[PDB]
Design a protein around this ligand. Structure first.
Ligand SMILES: [Mg+2]
Ligand SMILES: [Zn+2]
Ligand SMILES: [Zn+2]
Ligand SMILES: [Zn+2]
Lengths: 49, 84, 196, 133, 513, 141, 86, 65, 266, 86, 114
């Protein structure tokens, strides 16, 4: 329940296919979680803090 | 267009697809309450019966093989060599 | 499933008699296949075991927090101060016969979770039933007592096999199928068929 | 109803290649300096130490299921201590006038070398091996 | 969508035949095969009718020539009824009916194979392990489908064409597409070894387990004081007669000291340890032979035997896995530590030797580009090799190694990354980049090109990563999980087009195409 | 009392940070052959220090025991299932009228834990059961 | 061959495994590597020649086809003769 | 949510030792591991049975009708 | 005396540490299994719920009750409900219990198994008594409750055995062991440097003489002596669980000889 | 680049007789072909689209098939000629 | 759902003898007894003791599948000695043993204190 309260959605309509953002950036360290992310479909777009 | 028993060209063997349809086709007929030209050594399964009807090559059927151009070659199950 | 993406289902239930046992007397609540370890390399599952098989003995809530100063070498030290194999392995006898097992096995407590999606919430069969109105084909879901989709892919597959008719079937005699009257002239669904 | 080979060999060495229960043994004869021997052996039911005096025999007898004991009072060409039974898979020619045959007992293999069993050694499966002392 | 279709969770049954599919009763009682009332059946048929549509072996509709249904679950004259030649009786699916089993997605001839029905308790479709890969399914809650034939000719197209055993050799790789896995495999080896001897009592039960056992207790490999049998010996009982197979791995010499390769004569293992190569989906493997030598039939029937025999012996020899299989000889740990450190300087050297502009550009283009290619190549070289140490120090009694040897599961890599050292992570090739203006994590000093920052995990999965290691590692893995989210998008489309392009292409009767 | 600050991503660029408050501070004047291998403290500029690393995680993972002992992807899946598991989603369930809901007859607080749980109120509302497990090939089921 | 498989590559996908077909022929008659054969050298060569005459893939009664036959057969025989060498 | 009667694994009874256990703590001020051995729970299978369990029930009761 | 003798070691009211000698493994285990899931016992096998205002839901409690160990020394004389011609349970094949509780105390009311009341005729025979071994004397806390939380139940004990559901078995755990100094090599000890040290030594070792290196391998050796320890839930004195076991089994082997005869006539 | 070509030794054996070669990075076959020094017999552009316009369809195919075979073969994925072929 | 009723693990149904004896054609003088509603608890035991009858040439059992409590048993013996009789002996032999055990046990138990 908590988990669903700390979730993020990244609206990349159109640019869904890139060596993109779905990537785990460095700036992300500490603010977002490294592992907790959905497989396929809309991966790395949605992040849990 | 029709092809004489001679001038025959196709395989002398039976395509699995041929056999399987025959077998199926026959069994179907058997279970349709059709005459069975062999001694049921106590078989109650139309397939099984058909399979026998086949290993004794006593199946009244003729495969008509059609050729891209329309003409066909007719082959009987009596002839067709069943290896597989 | 455990907490290391080690999801699995049940494949059968046994009883203390059939289950393998340890001289101590104990027996397993659950049996996972070792082949679910190498290629997946989930050592934490493997480690949770050893840790817990100890905390359960000392009654000291074993800490398995991320980056810390805890060792496998250091847990085995505790666990042996308790009498059992320093590695967690234990001797075990075959339930059926009762003869020792040539090998030894990894035996221990391991928090597992029971996640939704239970078989009976899925089993689902049909053979003729409700029929979509417009289409006149089976209907969707099991809840509405519907049927199953025999899609392009399962189609291409039959064609591949050569199963000419098992196909015609799935498509006619097993779904749509309908009879109609055509005109031998204007090839249409015109014709007024008063079937009496 | 015969015998097929007799001699005594001396172990040149014993090799337990990661095999806690079996060791392959090679030994030379005490007659012709041509007869050499290579043979796997169960070192748990019949230990063997380097340099020993072993007796080797063969023969094809004393093929219908195998009968357990009972014969506690029957035939027993078992005046030995180790007695296996297997098959031969090849008859090789180690150049010149030297022929060697290979054997196998459900896993255990055997290699022999010489030349006077031209009419002695058969080419059939049957063949019991023996060893004593 | 279609009628006469079913779907549930599936599981593994080391007791069914390859071609079988354990259907749960629940379904059998719901799916009906319309049979035709005929003198051959009338007796047995009416029997069902009577049996009602609730007892298993039963039926649930009867139909007269007048084209009208008889709802056997109601219709006052339920118990009544005298069947008739030419009538039909939609009956319950019974053991041995031919069915079209399958898992999605379907892009393989081997994604839909016919099977011998086998009504069973509990609600899960049951299949044989060795027919797992053709469907490419796991029992992690994998739903499979099932379609039931309807005519006699239809069920014949499934029997004579789409039948699991008929599918053992794959046309798109001219080789077997079904093997022998996990337990069975991992065990058939432990059972084979020269060091594996079985005594009477057991030797028998095994013999028995094999359904075609000519009922001839085979003369013991050993007799001397205590009569024993070799694993190879009885397993051989599973191998028909007329089988011949020569192998020769590496040091193989018709006396294979390492018990390499393998000889099988007149269906009897003469020598050599059995495993993946011998009993897997390999080309000239045991299966490939049997199928081509004896017949599709004989083959399928072969898996069974092996499985049963083996599985049984395994059940009693037992097999496990645990942390103990990941910890290596104390010294081999240090020996690794330093083998890592030494590989750090061999880097550091090339570090200053490039900070002092003494680095040959190299055909490798760009000095910097040419720098990396040396560093990486230096650390990898260390991992692979850091492991080559543990891999050889793990005794022949280490479960993990055993699963690897038998090849049931695992690669030596998996050994390294667990007991020796993980390795250098990566993103598009170029080790961990600088998202953090001239560095990796704010826990680092600007312009640090050392390995511990460009993303090199020095610890083994056993010791456990560090904040930094852990984090990079992540970025690294999370990659696949992406080129899978996009690949998946275009993959599909390709797959279809090809297919939609070559539909109509079939070998005609003139042998043209 | 200025003893801790809120540093975002941007202002994170221009700073240095210590992992551990201890290990990464004292002087260098032996080392466990079992532990892992952490680099060093080659710097004396540390603007800030990390409370505890674990905090880089999210709800999900926070529950995984020893996530620092598994192939990164394993933890990525496990953090997608603890969502499909069962437990005690509250304690007023016997008074709630929500469509669907699942409760475990006998919950059990895990034997293997993460200090991080303490704030996730887990020991107070578990989601599994410490099952006695044996990794063995048995029936082949 | 060298004009086809320039690479030099000798291993190829071909019907009829002849390596085995013989291994069977071997221990199926318990042949012994001691005593001499009994084959007329006419036997071998003149037979292996008749063999190919029957590995028919196409059948036609005319040239065009009976020519395409010799083709679809080629790459094989070469393996054949390669193996059934006097 | 109420102690469990008997330990899933081996079966020995258990549901009574609750208050007895929860007592050797608050009153006899002891350390869990020792309390259990004192309640006859020798093996971890049962041992764990108690040590773990969370009496949510108590929190349930605190409700109303 | 004649064959399979015994030397009971430690032994009490709930445990039976004993050295069963001169027998066959097979048998040793057979018995074990029997003692586990084939010794008949009684337990609640049905619950008629009149009124429940507790937090726990019906079946939940229902379930609990089943487990509640019940007396059953005189179980051998109380026919299996599926035989007591009576349509659906006679006094001749089933005890019947009751449970009623009310939230009187303005402070949590514990409902134990002692609160169980037998209502049918015992016909004078130890049976259906909620077993108790508690110190205070109120064994098995069946459920708790607040203010006006009511609970009215109707329990119907019956025969049945673990095989048919665990709530029956009077076993609870059985120790088993032999060849403590692995002399038959029925196991290959997994190690790292030296099994001996790494692999703990069981207390049972003393009761059998150690190895003695040099000595070859004893291949004719088989398995006598089995260090067993039968624990009990209480529904039967430990001892019987051992005896009644040795019996049920004994009885089974008979039904085969018996069945063979009922088959020799035709 | 120094490629390792295998070729007929005078003695018969097949051996590695390395050769230097140029790999473009833009493409205009039509003319890089008519340049002296190159073997306009072994030239090749991964762009079969061209190798078709220049060299002629049949060769095009050859390239096509060749290109395809590779794509699939970098995964180490065998696929019996016939298919891709078709 | 599809779960069979627990009691089918020891309660024979309509028309099913604990025993069913079939002649094995593979070998001479051998039989296959199908013990319904039984399992290892018994099978293995009979099997084991059945092995001491020196007049017995073959004895092995097997649970054809876990879902079904029932097992097969095969017996073979020295021509002139019907198996069934060998089967009995085994059983009896078994009983006598147990009997003694029952006995000898009690004895030791009564001599105990606590
Ligand atoms: Mg999947
Ligand atoms: Zn018209
Ligand atoms: Zn317990
Ligand atoms: Zn009654």
């Amino acid at each position: 329940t908590l988990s669903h309260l700390r979730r993020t959605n990244t609206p990349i309509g159109r640019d869904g296919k890139l060596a993109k953002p779905r990537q785990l950036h460095n700036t992300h360290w500490g603010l977002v979680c490294p592992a907790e992310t959905p497989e396929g479909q809309a991966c790395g777009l949605v992040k849990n803090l | 267009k029709a092809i004489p028993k001679d001038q025959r060209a196709t395989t002398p063997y039976m395509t699995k697809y041929e056999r399987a349809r025959i077998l199926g086709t026959r069994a179907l007929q058997i279970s349709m309450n059709a005459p069975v030209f062999v001694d049921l050594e106590g078989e109650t399964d139309p397939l099984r019966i058909a399979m026998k009807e086949l290993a004794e090559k006593k199946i009244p059927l003729v495969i008509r093989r059609y050729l891209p151009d329309g003409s066909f070659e007719d082959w009987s199950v009596e002839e067709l060599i069943v290896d597989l | 499933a455990s907490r290391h993406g080690q999801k699995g289902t049940i494949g059968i239930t046994y009883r203390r008699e059939d289950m393998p046992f340890t001289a101590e007397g104990i027996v397993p609540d659950l049996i996972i296949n070792p082949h679910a370890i190498p290629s997946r390399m989930t050592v934490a599952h493997l480690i949770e075991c050893l840790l817990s098989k100890v905390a359960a003995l000392s009654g000291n809530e074993g800490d398995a927090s991320p980056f810390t100063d805890i060792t496998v070498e250091g847990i085995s030290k505790l666990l042996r101060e308790h009498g059992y194999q320093s590695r967690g392995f234990e001797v075990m006898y075959n339930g059926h016969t009762g003869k020792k097992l040539m090998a030894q096995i990894f035996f221990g407590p391991t928090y597992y979770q029971r996640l939704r999606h239970m078989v009976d919430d899925k089993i689902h069969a049909r053979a003729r039933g409700p029929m979509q109105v417009l289409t006149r084909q089976p209907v969707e879901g099991r809840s509405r007592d519907g049927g199953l989709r025999f899609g392009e892919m399962e189609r291409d597959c039959m064609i591949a096999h050569g199963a000419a008719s098992f196909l015609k079937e799935r498509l006619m005699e097993a779904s749509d199928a309908f009879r109609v009257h055509i005109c031998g002239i204007c090839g249409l669904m015109t014709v007024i068929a008063k079937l009496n | 109803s015969n015998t097929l080979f007799d001699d005594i060999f001396q172990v040149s060495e014993v090799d337990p290649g990661r095999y806690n229960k079996v060791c392959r043994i090679e030994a030379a004869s005490t007659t012709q300096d041509q007869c050499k021997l290579t043979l796997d052996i169960n070192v748990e039911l019949f230990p063997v130490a380097a340099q020993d005096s072993l007796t080797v025999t063969i023969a094809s007898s004393l093929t219908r299921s195998w009968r357990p004991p009972q014969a506690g009072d029957r035939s027993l060409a078992d005046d030995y201590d180790y007695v296996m039974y297997g098959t031969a898979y090849k008859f090789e020619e180690v150049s010149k006038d030297l022929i060697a045959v290979y054997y196998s007992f459900g896993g255990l293999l055997m290699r022999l070398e010489g030349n006077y069993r031209n009419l002695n050694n058969l080419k059939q499966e049957n063949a019991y091996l023996l060893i004593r002392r | 969508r279609v009628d006469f279709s079913a779907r549930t969770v599936i599981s593994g049954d080391p007791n069914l035949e390859l071609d079988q599919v354990g259907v749960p009763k629940s379904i059998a009682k719901t799916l009906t095969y319309p049979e035709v009332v005929t003198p051959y059946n009338i007796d047995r048929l009416t029997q069902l009718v009577r049996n009602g549509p609730n007892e298993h072996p039963g039926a649930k509709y009867v139909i007269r020539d007048s084209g009208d249904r008889i709802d056997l679950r109601y219709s006052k004259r339920a118990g009544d009824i005298q069947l008739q030649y030419g009538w039909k009786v939609e009956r319950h699916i019974m053991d041995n009916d031919p069915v079209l089993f399958n898992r999605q997605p379907s892009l393989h001839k081997m994604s839909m194979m016919a099977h011998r029905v086998k009504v069973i308790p509990y609600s899960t479709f049951r299949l044989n392990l060795s027919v797992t890969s053709p469907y490419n399914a796991d029992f992690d809650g994998d739903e499979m489908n099932l379609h039931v034939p309807q005519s006699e000719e239809t069920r014949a197209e499934l029997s004579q064409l789409c039948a699991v055993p008929l599918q053992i050799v794959s046309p798109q790789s001219n080789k077997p597409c079904m093997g022998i896995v996990q337990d069975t495999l991992c065990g058939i080896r432990k059972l084979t070894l020269r060091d594996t001897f079985i005594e009477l009592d057991q030797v028998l039960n095994m013999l028995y387990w094999v359904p075609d056992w000519d009922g001839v207790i085979p003369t013991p490999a050993i007799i001397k004081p205590k009569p024993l049998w070799s694993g190879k010996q009885i397993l051989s009982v599973a191998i028909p007669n007329g089988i011949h197979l020569q192998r020769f791995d590496e040091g193989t010499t018709l006396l294979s000291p390492k018990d390499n390769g393998m000889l099988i004569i007149d269906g009897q293992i003469i020598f050599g340890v059995v495993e993946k190569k011998t009993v897997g989906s390999s080309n000239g493997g045991l299966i490939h032979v049997v199928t081509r030598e004896k017949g599709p039939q004989v083959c399928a029937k072969l898996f069974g035997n092996i499985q049963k025999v083996v599985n049984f012996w395994l059940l009693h020899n037992g097999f496990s896995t645990g942390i103990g299989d990941t910890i290596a000889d104390g010294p081999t740990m240090r020996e690794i530590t330093e083998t890592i450190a030494e590989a750090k300087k061999k880097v550091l050297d090339v570090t200053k030797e490039a900070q002092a502009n003494l680095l040959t550009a190299k055909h490798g283009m760009t000095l910097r580009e040419s720098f990396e290619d040396n560093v990486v190549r230096f650390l990898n070289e260390a991992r692979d090799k850091a492991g080559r140490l543990a891999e050889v120090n793990l005794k022949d009694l280490n479960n993990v190694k055993q699963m690897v040897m038998a090849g049931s599961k695992g690669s030596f890599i998996n050994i390294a990354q667990m007991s020796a050292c993980v390795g250098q992570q990566s993103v598009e090739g170029k080790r961990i980049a600088f998202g953090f203006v001239d560095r990796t994590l704010p826990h680092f000093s600007k312009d640090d090109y050392s390995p511990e920052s460009k993303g090199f995990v020095e610890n083994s999965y056993l010791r456990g990563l560090t904040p930094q290691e852990f984090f990079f590692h992540a970025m690294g893995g999370r990659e696949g999980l992406i080129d899978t989210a996009v690949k998946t998008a275009e993959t599909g489309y390709i797959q279809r087009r090809l297919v939609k392009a070559l539909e109509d292409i079939m070998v005609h009767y003139d042998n043209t195409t | 009392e200025g003893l801790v600050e809120y540093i975002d991503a941007e202002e994170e660029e221009s700073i240095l940070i210590a992992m551990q408050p201890e290990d990464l501070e004292p002087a260098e004047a032996d080392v466990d052959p079992a532990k892992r291998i952490r680099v060093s403290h080659h710097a004396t500029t540390f603007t800030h220090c990390e409370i505890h690393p674990s905090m880089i995680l999210g709800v999900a993972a926070s529950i995984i025991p020893f996530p620092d002992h598994n192939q990164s992807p394993r933890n990525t899946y496990q953090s997608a299932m603890g969502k499909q598991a069962m437990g005690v989603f509250l304690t007023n369930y016997n008074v709630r009228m929500d469509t669907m809901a699942n409760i475990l007859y006998y919950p059990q607080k895990p034997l293997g834990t993460t200090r991080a749980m303490e704030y996730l109120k887990f020991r107070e509302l578990p989601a599994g059961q410490n099952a006695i497990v044996a990794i063995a090939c048995y029936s082949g089921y | 061959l060298r004009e086809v498989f320039v690479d030099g590559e000798a291993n190829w996908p071909l019907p009829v495994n002849i390596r085995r077909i013989i291994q069977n022929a071997q221990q199926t008659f318990h042949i012994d590597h001691t005593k001499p054969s009994d084959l007329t050298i006419k036997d071998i060569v003149l037979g292996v020649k008749d063999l190919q005459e029957n590995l028919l893939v196409l059948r036609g009664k005319n040239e065009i086809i009976q020519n395409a036959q010799r083709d679809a057969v080629t790459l094989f025989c070469c393996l054949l003769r390669s193996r059934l060498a006097t | 949510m109420i102690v469990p009667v008997r330990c899933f694994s081996c079966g020995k009874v258990v549901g009574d030792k609750w208050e007895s256990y929860l007592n050797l703590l608050q009153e006899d001020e002891l350390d869990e591991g020792t309390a259990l051995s004192r309640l006859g729970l020798k093996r971890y299978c049962c041992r764990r049975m108690i040590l773990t369990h969370v009496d949510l029930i108590e929190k349930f009761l605190r409700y109303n009708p | 005396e004649e064959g399979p003798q015994v030397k009971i070691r430690e032994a009490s009211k709930d445990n039976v540490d004993f050295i069963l000698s001169n027998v066959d493994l097979a048998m040793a285990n057979s018995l074990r299994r029997v003692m586990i899931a084939e010794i008949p016992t009684l337990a609640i096998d049905s619950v008629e719920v009149e009124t429940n205002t507790t937090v726990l839901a019906d079946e939940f409690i229902a379930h609990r009750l089943g487990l509640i160990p019940l007396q059953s020394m005189d179980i051998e004389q109380l026919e299996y409900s599926r035989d007591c011609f009576c349509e659906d349970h006679c006094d001749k094949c089933s005890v019947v219990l009751t449970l009623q509780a009310f939230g009187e105390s303005e402070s949590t009311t514990n409902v134990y198994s002692k609160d169980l009341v037998i209502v049918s005729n015992l016909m004078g025979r130890n049976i259906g008594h909620p077993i108790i071994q508690d110190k205070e004397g109120n064994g098995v806390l069946i459920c708790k409750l607040r203010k006006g939380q009511e609970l009215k139940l109707t329990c119907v004990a019956k025969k049945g055995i673990a095989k048919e559901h665990a709530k029956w078995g009077p076993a609870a755990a059985i120790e088993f062991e032999y060849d403590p100094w692995n002399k038959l090599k029925h196991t290959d000890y997994w190690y790292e440097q030296d099994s001996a040290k790494e692999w703990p030594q069981s207390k049972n070792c003393e009761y059998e003489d150690p190895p003695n290196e040099g000595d070859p391998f004893d291949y004719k050796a088989q398995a006598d002596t089995f260090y067993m320890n039968v624990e009990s839930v209480g529904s039967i004195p430990v001892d019987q669980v051992v005896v009644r076991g040795i019996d049920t089994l004994q009885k089974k082997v008979a039904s085969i000889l018996l069945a063979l005869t009922q088959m020799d006539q035709d | 680049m120094k490629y390792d070509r295998k070729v007929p030794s005078p003695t018969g054996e097949y051996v590695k007789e390395p050769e230097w070669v140029l790999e473009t990075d833009g493409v205009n076959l039509s003319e890089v072909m008519t340049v002296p020094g190159i073997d306009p017999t072994r030239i090749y552009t991964n762009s079969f689209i061209d190798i078709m316009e220049v060299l002629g369809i049949e060769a095009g195919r050859a390239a096509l098939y060749k290109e395809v075979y590779n794509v699939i073969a970098s995964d180490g994925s065998y696929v019996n000629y016939r298919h891709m072929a078709l | 759902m599809n779960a069979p009723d627990r009691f089918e693990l020891f309660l024979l149904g309509e028309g099913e003898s604990k025993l069913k004896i079939d002649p094995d054609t593979k070998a001479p003088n051998a039989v296959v007894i199908t013990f319904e509603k039984e399992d290892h608890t018994l099978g293995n035991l009979i099997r084991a003791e059945l092995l001491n009858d020196r007049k017995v040439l073959f004895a092995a059992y097997k649970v054809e599948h876990p879902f079904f409590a029932r097992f097969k048993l095969r017996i073979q013996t020295t021509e002139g000695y019907d198996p069934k009789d060998a089967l009995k002996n085994a059983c009896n032999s078994i009983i006598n043993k147990l009997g003694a055990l029952k006995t000898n046990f009690e004895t030791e138990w009564n001599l105990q204190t606590l």
